[PDB]
Design a protein around this ligand. Sequence first.
Ligand code: NDP
Ligand code: NDP
Ligand code: MTX
Ligand code: MTX
Ligand code: 1UF
Ligand code: 1UF
Ligand code: UFP
Ligand code: UFP
Lengths: 505, 505
Amino acid sequence: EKNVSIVVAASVLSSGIGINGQLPWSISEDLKFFSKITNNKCDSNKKNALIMGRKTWDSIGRRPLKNRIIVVISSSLPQDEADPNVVVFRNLEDSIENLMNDDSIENIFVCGGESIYRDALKDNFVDRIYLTRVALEDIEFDTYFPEIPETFLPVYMSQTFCTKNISYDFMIFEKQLKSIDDTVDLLGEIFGIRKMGNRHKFPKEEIYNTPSIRFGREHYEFQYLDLLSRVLENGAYRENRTGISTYSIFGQMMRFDMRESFPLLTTKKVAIRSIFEELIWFIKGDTNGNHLIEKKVYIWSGNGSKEYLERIGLGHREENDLGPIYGFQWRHYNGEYKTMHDDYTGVGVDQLAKLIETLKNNPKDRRHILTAWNPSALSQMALPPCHVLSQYYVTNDNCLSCNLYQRSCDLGLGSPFNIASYAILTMMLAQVCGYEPGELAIFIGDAHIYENHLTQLKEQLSRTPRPFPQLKFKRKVENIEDFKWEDIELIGYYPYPTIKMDMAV
Amino acid sequence: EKNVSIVVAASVLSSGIGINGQLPWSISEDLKFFSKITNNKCDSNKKNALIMGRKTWDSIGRRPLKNRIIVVISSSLPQDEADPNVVVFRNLEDSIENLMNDDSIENIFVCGGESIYRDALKDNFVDRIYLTRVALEDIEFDTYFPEIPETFLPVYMSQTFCTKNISYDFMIFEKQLKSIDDTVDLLGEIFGIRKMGNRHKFPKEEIYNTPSIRFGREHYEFQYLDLLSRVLENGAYRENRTGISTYSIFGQMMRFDMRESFPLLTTKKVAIRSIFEELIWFIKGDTNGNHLIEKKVYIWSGNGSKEYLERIGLGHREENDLGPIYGFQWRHYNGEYKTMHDDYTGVGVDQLAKLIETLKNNPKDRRHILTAWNPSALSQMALPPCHVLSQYYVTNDNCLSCNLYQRSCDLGLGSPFNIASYAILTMMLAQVCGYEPGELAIFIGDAHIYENHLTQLKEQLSRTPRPFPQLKFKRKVENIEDFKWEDIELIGYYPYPTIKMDMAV
Ligand SMILES: NC(=O)C1=CN([C@@H]2O[C@H](COP(=O)(O)OP(=O)(O)OC[C@H]3O[C@@H](n4cnc5c(N)ncnc54)[C@H](OP(=O)(O)O)[C@@H]3O)[C@@H](O)[C@H]2O)C=CC1
Ligand SMILES: NC(=O)C1=CN([C@@H]2O[C@H](COP(=O)(O)OP(=O)(O)OC[C@H]3O[C@@H](n4cnc5c(N)ncnc54)[C@H](OP(=O)(O)O)[C@@H]3O)[C@@H](O)[C@H]2O)C=CC1
Ligand SMILES: CN(Cc1cnc2nc(N)nc(N)c2n1)c1ccc(C(=O)N[C@@H](CCC(=O)O)C(=O)O)cc1
Ligand SMILES: CN(Cc1cnc2nc(N)nc(N)c2n1)c1ccc(C(=O)N[C@@H](CCC(=O)O)C(=O)O)cc1
Ligand SMILES: Cc1[nH]c2nc(N)[nH]c(=O)c2c1Sc1ccc(C(=O)N[C@@H](CCC(=O)O)C(=O)O)c(Cl)c1
Ligand SMILES: Cc1[nH]c2nc(N)[nH]c(=O)c2c1Sc1ccc(C(=O)N[C@@H](CCC(=O)O)C(=O)O)c(Cl)c1
Ligand SMILES: O=c1[nH]c(=O)n([C@H]2C[C@H](O)[C@@H](COP(=O)(O)O)O2)cc1F
Ligand SMILES: O=c1[nH]c(=O)n([C@H]2C[C@H](O)[C@@H](COP(=O)(O)O)O2)cc1F
């Protein structure tokens, strides 16, 4: 018995692999990945056999690959005994004689050919599958990769990488000490909630997104999905200011990469425009909710309504005057707030300006902090800061990383919007200060799920993640307040259908 | 061949197991652990054999244990053929006939007897060791547990549990798929710093605290030690405001249990008194450094000196006037600071009082937040807030959990002090509001190690952790500012010797 793995780069959705006898993309990192994954061996006296179709053999210019033996499947190509590195077989089955004979082969790889892939799956010869998903679908294909049968299960999903503004992943599909575990279980039986391990139980398979991927959960959307599962598992059913109770856990975190991708969820279509518009609405220090409604953004409607304002003791306030909320504390901290129409120029502390100036004039500083929690202004605010305080960090390789603490997190609505918002903000601060995006760490206090989002989020958990999109700015601005929606280019975003969820006012 | 494990509860330091023919402690959880770990089996048709000394057999009142076969080692006790659950052998070697014969035995356990333990180790018959470390040493022993030979390695260390104010651990000593790993390594070779996984490399064995414990690192001091290893591994060498450069990483966290223990480091003797004194110094809202110095606490000496103050542009300030720092922002937020001698009573916003009142009048609130970051007062402060913002959470079972965000962390000096300080603070807030301590999560921004603490911390990493101590209050106070050092009782703290490290001014 010898291992036979499949290596293939297909598109994310339609699984296209070629067009007009060639690849519909040019990713050097992918070809390098193929090279290293096919050259991987233990015995130095052995080589790896590469099975490919005749047309694929024509595609590579009919030239052998070093340290490997290319096996060409063709009904016309003569058995060339000249080249000792290339061999031709009449059928796929006979080509796999490497098992019974020729001990100079350590591993067998199916490298390409839809006609080859399909009958390599149909006749069941494949043990492992190395799938390289590529994020582009608005192009033309003529050669596709056959749908993976249910006999295979994903065991690995790498982070999203970027080459020429193209997002791509690396996945592995597999055909499928006791003492410590037993001891921990026993301690979990003796001590109940006393044992902290029992307070943080591992999510069950029924609510675990892609359960088959256990040790290879490298994709950073899992940082959010596994959190969703954790709140779904250990979430204490508790009440709150709203009539809708939540299942809540305390003390969590999510990590994200922004260098090679953009942390925008693919399991659900997220309204990016509203996120950006809200972000620049903050940056300007604007507190007028109507300005968001005029631009068809209704995320501050429920927390802005006259009824809600009169209910929280702000009946004197205008229809959509949210008060000294986010942005007003960014640009005018400790500034005496009157109405949303007043001109607060020069008043208060401009945290954003000092933040930028400190970021570019003193990068290795440890005080790059933007806060929104003002005890003196909390009573005037329509809604206390959820994404409370953020800190920024300039790495040695000129990258900008962002940490955000969030006191309360709506994993259904608030969370993705926050992730994307601070990602975009980090990118803006990066471009303005002349840096590159780095990492985004979000530390969550009260991580909760509303009881009216149960079926929806459980539906979202039933979706296997896709590679993160890319976010590029079309122009470089001099002032951070000059960003426009037309200046934003979102590349390679192919998410699952949107999920309608109601906001608890 | 059959597995032979040793089960033993010994003291943490001198490894005492008995006194005057009985146990020097009474822990029901420990005896229950013994019962479950000795009753653990696969075959229902088989039983487990329990080998013990004659004196141990006398200790249990000479009564058999259910579902187990007790093997008594004695040169005087007659071979009782009456009881089929108890059997007597003349020597330990002959006693291990359970291997060659009697297939009705599935596992073999050495349950007690120093005379038995010592020659069970000396003749090498033991495969596994279940050690229950107990935290008390100021008592009398007459029977000890022999020192574990180098042939054994720890693979597990449970969290610290508490019974009758006694701390204890559960440890296991053992006598000692590739595809995903290969793929990740290859991707790490192709992509360099581009791959985020390579930016967060797993610490090397040379700087990994107790490397043998891989999957059983349950002890929560590992939350700090593994962080130390991570910064020691991936730490970017960068400069700062002080002349001493640091190795720094960004975005980390540490979790801690406070229900069954107290997160005070045992790998280094931490000055708990200074921590507490600083804490109540904060609670009172005092900014006078001398008040801390008068009580022989010199942690705020360097950041208070006249030279340092004049250097940071505060030459007008008195010898130890630290300005609107911690406590002043807790009790008098946005209060105009003059000197440390002025009476700031009634002025500013009392965050702490409102925090307590909200905690006891509305536990399920999501705004339980105490902040210290005030942009308007940063220029006056001798040192901007490191432990910036904290949030508190009242669980359904009336427990108090605490989250703390820290912008900058000195893993040598500041970190343990912060952990212990907010732990004690959480306990105080728990008692005052009528709750019990829960969990402590610390989210760290700039986690760094000063270059003059290298050899010291590398020395600290060479010490295998001991169970966390216990913290009990001797009296219940009506006001949180009424806490005294005499009211604090630290039980079972047996740490490694102190490690002298200098503070970078
Ligand atoms: N993204 C990726 O990883 C890869 C993409 N590609 C792309 O896909 C395309 C190639 O795939 P495709 O269009 O399907 O062409 P194929 O490479 O699959 O053609 C295979 C050839 O092998 C011979 N052959 C196949 N099956 C049999 C059989 N059962 N018995 C005898 N001979 C057989 C035939 O040659 P003959 O005429 O002699 O009978 C056939 O033309 C190209 O555009 C290529 O660039 C290719 C490889 C990898
Ligand atoms: N903390 C823990 O987990 C445990 C603690 N303990 C404590 O330890 C103490 C008891 O241990 P200890 O004092 O060492 O006494 P032991 O338990 O080791 O019993 C020793 C007896 O076993 C017989 N024996 C021992 N070795 C031999 C041998 N090589 N050949 C023949 N017979 C042998 C002898 O009995 P004989 O007189 O017939 O010759 C001897 O007196 C108690 O205080 C007990 O409470 C005990 C078990 C567990
Ligand atoms: C047409 N074709 C098939 C092809 C293309 N992309 C793929 N991409 C993936 N992820 N998997 C495949 N099996 C795959 N196959 C090609 C084209 C070029 C090379 C190639 O040049 N390989 C060199 C790469 C050289 C290098 O980057 O160092 C090697 O040494 O293996 C291989 C296959
Ligand atoms: C004297 N002695 C030896 C003893 C005491 N403490 C230990 N503690 C540890 N961790 N390990 C040991 N091997 C151990 N042995 C004892 C004393 C009581 C019981 C005992 O009561 N066993 C019951 C436990 C009943 C229960 O608590 O539920 C059982 O069912 O096995 C066992 C051994
Ligand atoms: C400002 C605010 N107040 C909230 N109160 C509760 N209970 N939960 C919240 O998330 C919030 C928020 S932030 C927020 C973010 C996104 C939305 C939102 O529109 N979510 C929907 C629709 C998005 C859209 O198309 O605009 C979704 O993502 O599926 C809303 Cl209502 C509020
Ligand atoms: C207040 C302050 N200022 C700091 N500046 C830098 N660069 N680093 C820091 O950790 C700090 C701190 S916090 C702090 C905490 C404990 C101590 C401290 O005295 N540690 C001693 C033990 C405590 C004692 O007995 O004083 C030690 O670990 O050897 C000090 Cl100096 C400062
Ligand atoms: O960015 C946001 N993210 C978020 O999750 N919320 C939710 C969290 C909470 O469920 C609700 C109200 O906050 P509070 O917990 O103080 O009632 O708003 C609000 C935001 F602005
Ligand atoms: O509780 C504390 N913990 C701590 O780690 N520091 C250290 C962090 C930093 O290395 C130094 C000064 O902070 P900054 O980064 O602003 O120089 O004080 C200070 C405290 F008060």
